[PDB]
Amino acid sequence: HRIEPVCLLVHGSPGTGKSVATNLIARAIAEAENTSTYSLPPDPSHFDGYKQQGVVIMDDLNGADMKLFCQMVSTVEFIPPMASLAAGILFTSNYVLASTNARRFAFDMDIQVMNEYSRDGKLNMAMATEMCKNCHQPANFKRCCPLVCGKAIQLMDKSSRVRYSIDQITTMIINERNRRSNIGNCME
Amino acid sequence: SKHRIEPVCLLVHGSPGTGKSVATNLIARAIAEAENTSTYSLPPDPSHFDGYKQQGVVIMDDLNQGADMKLFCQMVSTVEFIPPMASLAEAGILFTSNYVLASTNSSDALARRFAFDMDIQVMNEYSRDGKLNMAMATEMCKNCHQPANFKRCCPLVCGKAIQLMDKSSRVRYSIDQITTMIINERNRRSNIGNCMEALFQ
Amino acid sequence: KHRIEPVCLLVHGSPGTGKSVATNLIARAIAEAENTSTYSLPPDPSHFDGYKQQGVVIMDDLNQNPDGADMKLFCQMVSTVEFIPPMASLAEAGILFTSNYVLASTNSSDALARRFAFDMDIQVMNEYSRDGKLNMAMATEMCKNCHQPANFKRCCPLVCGKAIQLMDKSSRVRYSIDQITTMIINERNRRSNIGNCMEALF
Amino acid sequence: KHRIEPVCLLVHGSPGTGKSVATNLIARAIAEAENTSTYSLPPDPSHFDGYKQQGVVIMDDLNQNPDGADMKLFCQMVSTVEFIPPMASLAEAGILFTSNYVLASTNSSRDALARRFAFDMDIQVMNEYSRDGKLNMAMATEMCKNCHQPANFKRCCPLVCGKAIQLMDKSSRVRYSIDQITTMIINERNRRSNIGNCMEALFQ
Ligand SMILES: [Zn+2]
Ligand SMILES: [Zn+2]
Ligand SMILES: [Zn+2]
Ligand SMILES: [Zn+2]
């Protein structure tokens, strides 16, 4: 009976800051869904630490990966395997976020280090994590910085072709999780 | 990375007619109005927090001092807690409750968790047949002085009908009293917490 | 060879006078200066579960009946002689008590009285007392115009002596948390300068 | 969980091939770069005497003794939890471990411990500087004559610029000189610390 988790992945070259992207997005929707974030390690088979957190992030997806993923983004009741048998909890996460190098991905997006923050083609993290000094307040973040507002990095949808900021991308994922929850409500 | 202040914990012991539920619930609607929240009550022998929307107070009843108590240790803590839900459309909410009140009638590392270990005691004028004369105890109070955590007073508020007695010290408190005692140990840990955060961070 | 005797502080106070926060500020400050952490014993300390040789130890509500246990423990902690605390866990049995500071508060022969390098009464300043209770809310407000504290990054009335002070039960002189906290560190350092030199000489 | 995981380097090599020389070179340059000192643990170490929260710690011959002593300490250090190391001198006990770099050499083949090596590398002596299979130290310490300035050392020698020894990342198989991998390690630590400060601020 469970609903299908909204899903995002982020293709990137290694120095472009896609780990900090997903994590910023995860922590934000988490803050809003009064939940927490579960990280899967790369190449992971067990869910030591899962406790039905509202959002999980999958560092460096992809192949058991493309399998254990498709159990996660499904309507089937699914039971993750454990390390300590201390087993049994359903997987209920309403969001899955992940990174790498087809309809289960409501948000298929490539990244772009903006040029004033490129450093040899790589994201200049020291500069990209300085706080923004002339910005409107973000929609899902307390405060603004260049990773949130689109200065340092942006997400390009392949299909849409459009470019959004992180702040925009989180507003978008929320809404789709709500739609899905809103219909999943009325029916029931 | 521990991030939440452990909640202040009250446990009232007592024989089953003694008002022991009525006390845990009088205190809780008092605190809740003070911090402008709501209450959320757990069933006896409970496993699921369905309907827990991070309201400020949690009531446990019939705590068996133990499934009752394994789950109790996890609420009263600093470490993040994720209540199990039966509904899938809810599972995922973080436990951020400040108070847990529990009642009972009935190993030192768990004891410290009981910030207030009281014994409910029914005063004789309000005890017909050996149990709370609830019709008496609820009648409003005529010349009582204004309570601290209630806008009006009655013989449960003011210790006329019902009083609870610290198991360890042995002194007696009314309901209206032990509320601020609890409100304040919660205000206490808040202000000390912020204070230290600001001096060493 | 042997361990130096932990410099020890005892704060006497009535219940709402803030002697726990007093001892906690002092500990955190000493521990920050010593590059350490703090370890709190629960009242009625039975076990030292979680103790990993944090240089600073806190005993909240010490009962000072010399027949009591609080004081029998206390006399092993505050001594020069190997003391291997009891752990409830046997997966934790064997670590030595090496802490250099012990900070305790209570409500109130000479061999227990030597152990207290500093024996002190806490005093609410009246401007912060709700019927002789520490008005914690306004005492934990940050100060706005204090000089930089000796041992705290920022100042507040709990630190500089606006809200609370500590009176020496002997000399009858009063001290802020900040002042007592450098006397306590100076004392441990004097013990250590002496102990370390005794070692080099032999 | 208040401290940041130290950045961690593991250099595998046979026993004459200069891996000790190479971790000490990296350590010393990282240390200058942060105005700290280095602290060296002995092989199969028990005690941390002399540890004063120097920023770079060094371990050699890790897991040489396969008993476990090496790997418990290692894992306590490459962690996010408070670690109060063991000392032989009682005077010295209780200091907190807070180094940001752990540099280890080994001769072994060692999920959640691999997670701790941010750089897992094999040392390879280039043939011109090999002598009977081991690193020719006397040749390698002669200063380079015509080399661009190195990023992390004041002058260049073949140990630095990749002439004498190289470091091959076991995963990717890419090779790096010492100077390069120093900038990489420094840059990982700064990144960790920049992301950290940002997350605190945004969820502050
Ligand atoms: Zn901005
Ligand atoms: Zn009344
Ligand atoms: Zn001040
Ligand atoms: Zn060179």
Author numbering:
A (entry chain C): 118 to 179, 184 to 207, 209 to 223, 239 to 325
B (entry chain E): 116 to 180, 184 to 224, 235 to 329
C (entry chain D): 117 to 224, 235 to 328
D (entry chain B): 117 to 226, 236 to 329
Copy the relevant paper text:
PV 2CATPase has only 329 residues but is very rich in features.
We report here the crystal structure of a soluble fragment of PV 2CATPase containing the complete ATPase and the C-terminal domains to a resolution limit of 2.55Å. The ATPase domain contains a five-stranded parallel β-sheet (β1-β5) surrounded by three α-helices (α1-α3). The cysteine-rich motif folds into a CCCC type zinc finger. There is an unusually long loop region between the second and third zinc ligands C272 and C281, on which N277 and F278 dock their side chains into a hydrophobic groove formed between α1 and α6 helices. We found that the C-terminal helix mediates self-oligomerization of PV 2CATPase via a specific interaction between 2C-2C, which is essential to ATPase activity.
